[PDB]
Design a protein around this ligand. Structure first.
Ligand SMILES: Nc1ncnc2c1ncn2[C@@H]1O[C@H](COP(=O)(O)OP(=O)(O)O)[C@@H](O)[C@H]1O
Ligand SMILES: Nc1ncnc2c1ncn2[C@@H]1O[C@H](COP(=O)(O)OP(=O)(O)O)[C@@H](O)[C@H]1O
Ligand SMILES: Nc1ncnc2c1ncn2[C@@H]1O[C@H](COP(=O)(O)OP(=O)(O)O)[C@@H](O)[C@H]1O
Ligand SMILES: [Mg+2]
Ligand SMILES: [Mg+2]
Ligand SMILES: [Mg+2]
Lengths: 371, 7, 371, 371, 7
């Protein structure tokens, strides 16, 4: 039987069977409910739409993300996401196949506990493992020594991993993520009088970000150009047909990854957290990391972010280093791909916790393997 | 409706 | 020479010289135009009317407010308002006195720029400034540490400003306001038999709103009190002298401030936007902010609102914490009171942008010290 | 005129006149700059804040320590700490009283010049001396021979002082200290779902470390007890009123002092660096030392730390050497206390570098000493 | 807000 691989991303759920080269199910991790009383009873409405359903019916629903910064905040909402993942999106009985769960680094013990409990007892999975997302990210490029800079909708994190072993004390988390950049995008679009408030409107702003924002290579000269010619500014049209112009705002939004001060976060920028994790690594190995900075997760998709990460972390490194930013295509779903790779293998076939083990030993098996 | 798009 | 302080509220304009403790002029901010052909050539009638002249002629004019949600939706009717503000209501030449305007948080950047051009190139002011409405208020409260819930006819803002250093990232703007509740009062009064439609009737509804309506301390219990008894029934005479008996309506009309789901907006109640604004700030200052919660603007004048506020945030906030809704009498004009203080506070005398500066740096000068 | 005694500790600056048995000033050595814009200009707001002013204003400031690990990082920041010490904390003109500066052993020779030059040329001290911290500690403990284990916010220092002299060859500078220990508390809190990131938030964690944390006499026995029963669990509520619930974390943090492995530190633990220091001595003085183990500096305060240190170092030494741990109260301040005694000696009153000596010799006065 | 004491 083929194990099931699920990337529990904060914004989108990527899932499939082991050995697929790309995820089968790729959908926004949304649970919806209706904002108004239902009146055409002959329609036969259902009380909570999920995934692409909620995104289809958008403006009659309140939209809930159950995962905030990797923390599962609402469990019955997340349980419905997994129910839909299994019975509808993949069409499989999860009690008959082993399951691979991705998880974010430095995420509290209880999240793994409740994930475990729900898998082993709501879905009765037969065997299971929970992988540190960055491991899978590095593995996805086929390399086995580097530092990963992961940056999803909910978490940005830096993990050094050498000869395939992680450095746990040298990990960093920064919660400034894709949602936060959507937040700041609202605020700056408000300057040109484009207000967006409802969750539905939030999704419009997410769409806008995903197609007109880009990482400026040279912020000062760019912003001087933006104050000198309209040629850097362009437009997009709403689901309401009307056009909206995105301008200075284009670059100002993604600039925040390097300047978290712009969202009033004192926390260091992504170039600083990568550097500050390399400098937490043992003095020997820093070279091996500089040739192997791998980017992963969807907010690493901004045009020019690689160029900026390079030209920035260049300044943080000493001169005479091969500072090479590994930013391929498929970085989008890389984490999942790595899951599928690792899942296919007899060595990893030792790692999966048997349901029976958990059943007999309680949470005491997972309380170890979470490190 | 007061703003440009949006309300 | 004495400067002028003018608050461009979406419903009523408040203006006067600095130093005074109440704003001399209050023209309700309305422009209105003849709804029919003028027939008596001997009357000496005029093209359009404003403020209390518009109120006097009300039953024959279409009424337009040229500010909505704080945005100046029409510039010619705003400029008419300023012409009447200065040369008719205050009998002062604005080209001989510095002037301070007021503006809402997060309002579109273009608004400040147009206002500035109209002041410097219609009214030829010597020097100008545009204070952020909330800010002025804490000055009006004395206290330089606190969170201001300003709620007028148009906007609602919840700035927290600490140790006198702001926290702009924590600002929340909720477009539920007094106009929105006037509009909702029309809908609920229909249920008992009363029709209001015209712009002129909107002002009669406003009068009913300013007299008989009040905030329930507990909606369900007071609801039930109606359902059991006539005890909350009170009556108001229209201009016809016919009495209209309204009830179950008073503690419903403004219950919208705590349940915007009644009016088909999505965002949480003014108590929830208060708590959530505090929760955006760095975790130390919260103790001091809960003890310095300030109310301002005419829609904070509902009887019972303080009690409801204090209990509502006492539910949301921690136990073993103290909640102080500082809500004085005269909370209403607690802006042209703060602006009076600010123009009097002689250390501020460098802040007024000079006409010569604006004539060199163009509209870009207005973005000096704002959000 | 009386002398002034100053302790340039990594975390808190302890200062006061000589002969006194407690310092007159004790404050966190922080330069705190604005995080945000000072909109209420009437405050008279400061370009930076220091000590208890910064700690009151915590929520609006970026808190920088000028000493990191043990070395001054930015001289002007340290210079502000000193300026504030004299004029604000002590309310004295530094031109008017002799001055003693504490210093760490093996601090590079140029630092001595910078300190000396600042104290004469910035602060006009009428006489000056610079002292090895650790000596002062034993001196204060009365005894004329022993091994010091001094640990503050930045450096753990072990010195065997014999016949009243530091033995320089035996001095084991250890880069593990209070600040480093603070970081690890952040992580083990994270396990249970509590988060803290901003540099303000760091200082909150410091408050927790100084209260709930303690040293267990034997690690897995204690931990097994804690894993069995919630009896070992306590709480402490943040400035935002929410209680934190804490058990297993309480012994786990300061365990690190015995296990630098927990933090990936290559250097040995606190008992270890003590032994490892003892063994380097002239063999005849080994027993002279073992009866004379002396603890000091703020990190030495944890309950059970002395009893643990005894059971720990007893393993490393050959038995029957009679190892004894000097750890009464007031050991929070032994270092500054020692200087206060030293500065009371009439011989020392002859021995200072005078202002006139520096005004003839400049910084070259140290070149006879520094080799 | 996610976090138990922080977000
Ligand atoms: N073209 C794009 N440019 C910038 N950001 C993007 C783009 N496409 C997707 N994203 C961001 O990727 C984030 C989610 O990526 P992903 O890692 O697949 O989901 P999750 O973060 O939930 O695991 C979203 O917040 C979205 O803003
Ligand atoms: N006694 C009252 N109780 C409740 N609301 C009131 C009362 N008096 C006036 N209001 C409302 O306050 C609104 C005006 O708000 P105000 O703060 O005075 O000016 P602005 O709207 O410019 O901020 C009016 O539209 C009115 O509906
Ligand atoms: N009672 C206590 N419990 C735990 N830690 C303490 C206690 N008292 C002081 N400390 C720690 O000691 C550190 C500083 O020690 P100290 O030697 O006084 O400062 P410095 O070395 O900078 O002079 C602080 O970081 C503080 O956390
Ligand atoms: Mg992800
Ligand atoms: Mg107003
Ligand atoms: Mg010290």
């Amino acid at each position: 039987i083929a194990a099931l691989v699920v990337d529990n991303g904060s914004g989108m759920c990527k899932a499939g069977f082991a050995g697929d080269d790309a995820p089968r199910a790729v959908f926004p991790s949304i649970v919806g409910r209706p904002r108004h009383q239902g009146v055409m009873v002959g329609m036969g409405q259902k009380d909570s739409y999920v995934g692409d359903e909620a995104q289809s019916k958008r403006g009659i629903l309140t939209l809930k993300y159950p995962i905030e910064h990797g923390i599962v905040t609402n469990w019955d909402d997340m349980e419905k996401i997994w129910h839909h993942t299994f019975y509808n999106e993949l069409r499989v009985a999860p009690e008959e196949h082993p399951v691979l769960l991705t998880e974010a680094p430095l995420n509290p013990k209880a999240n793994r506990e409740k994930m475990t409990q729900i898998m082993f007892e709501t879905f009765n999975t037969p065997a299971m493992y929970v992988a540190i997302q960055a491991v899978l990210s590095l593995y996805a490029s086929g390399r086995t020594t580097g530092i990963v800079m992961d940056s999803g909708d909910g978490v940005t994190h830096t993990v050094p991993i050498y000869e395939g072993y992680a450095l746990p004390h040298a990990i960093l988390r920064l919660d400034l993520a894709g949602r936060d950049l959507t937040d700041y995008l609202m605020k700056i679009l408000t300057e040109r009088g484009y207000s967006f408030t409802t969750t539905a409107e939030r999704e419009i702003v997410r769409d806008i970000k995903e197609k007109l924002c880009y990482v400026a290579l040279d912020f000062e000269q760019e912003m001087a150009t933006a104050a000198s010619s309209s040629s850097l500014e362009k437009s997009y049209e709403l689901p309401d047909g009307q056009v909206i112009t995105i301008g200075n705002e284009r670059f100002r939004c993604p600039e925040a990854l390097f300047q978290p001060s712009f969202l009033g976060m004192e926390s260091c920028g992504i170039h600083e957290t990568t550097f500050n994790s390399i400098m937490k690594c043992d003095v020997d190995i820093r070279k091996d990391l500089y040739a192997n900075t791998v980017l992963s997760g969807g907010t690493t998709m901004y045009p020019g972010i690689a160029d900026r990460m390079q030209k920035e972390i260049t300044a943080l490194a000493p001169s005479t280093m091969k500072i090479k930013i590994i930013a391929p295509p498929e970085r989008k779903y890389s984490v999942w791909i790595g899951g599928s790779i690792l899942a296919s293998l007899s060595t990893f076939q030792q790692m999966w916790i048997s349901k029976q083990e958990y059943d007999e030993s309680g949470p005491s098996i997972v309380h170890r393997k979470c490190f | 409706p007061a703003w440009x798009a949006x309300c």
